[PDB]
């Protein structure tokens, strides 16, 4: 089941190129029919505001849903990640 | 099924008395055996930091699990709420 490993990779790469994302902490993805439904946690600067972290999450969603073909549901939340 | 409405009320009141919580936005609660498992979204100042919002969520968890008897699982996340 490695068509899923390929896709997870592209999702991770896609997300990380959005401003403010410091790593994908967590990504769950499953096939629903021919579609992918995913849920993601991104690391963000602990000192970003809550409203900034929301904006980053939305940009990640737009970027991934925009770029990655079979993704039809993506939930994105944020956690503090110091690096 | 109104032993659940009573408990949801006490959870909401409990959470709202934690510093930085501006309303409970969402609370899902279910009985697992004789226990309650719940998941909650609190409103917080959009200008709090991410790390502050984490701390508020943890204080809500400590407060609710500490005070409300049959709750054995509580997940708490934060969303921006301007008021």
Numbering used by the authors:
A (entry chain A), B (entry chain A): 211 to 293
Show sentences the authors wrote.
One group of metal ion efflux transporters that regulates metal ion homeostasis and can be found in all domains of life is the Cation Diffusion Facilitator (CDF) protein family. One of the most highly conserved and abundant integral MM proteins is the CDF transporter MamM. MamM was recently proposed to function as a magnetosome-directed iron transporter required for iron biomineralization since its deletion abolished magnetite biomineralization and mutation of residues within the conserved TMD metal-binding site resulted in alterations of magnetite crystal size, morphology and even mineral phase. To summarize our results we present an alternative model for the CDF CTD mode of action, in which we propose that upon metal cation binding, the CTD induces conformational changes towards a tighter and more compact fold which allows the activation of iron transport through the TMD.
To gain a better understanding of the contribution of these binding sites to protein function two double alanine point mutations were also analyzed. In vivo the introduction of double point mutations in the central putative binding site (D249A and H285A) resulted in decreased Cmag values similar to D249A. Although the average particle number per cell was almost identical between the D249A and the D249A + H285A strains, the latter strain produced particles with significantly reduced mean diameters (−12%, P<0.001, Mann-Whitney test). In addition, this strain also showed a slower restoration of its magnetic response upon induction of biomineralization by adding iron back to iron-starved cells. ITC results for the central putative binding site double mutant (D249A and H285A) displayed a reduced number of binding sites (1.8±0.2) in reference to the wild-type data and therefore suggests that a single cation binds to each peripheral binding site. To confirm that these observed phenotypic differences are due to true transport function alternations, we also examined the expression levels of all MamM mutants, their ability to stabilize MamB expression, performed MD simulations for dimer stability evaluation and determined their CTD structures. (ii) All mutants exhibited an apo-MamM CTD-like behavior along the MD simulations, and (iii) an absence of structural differences was observed.
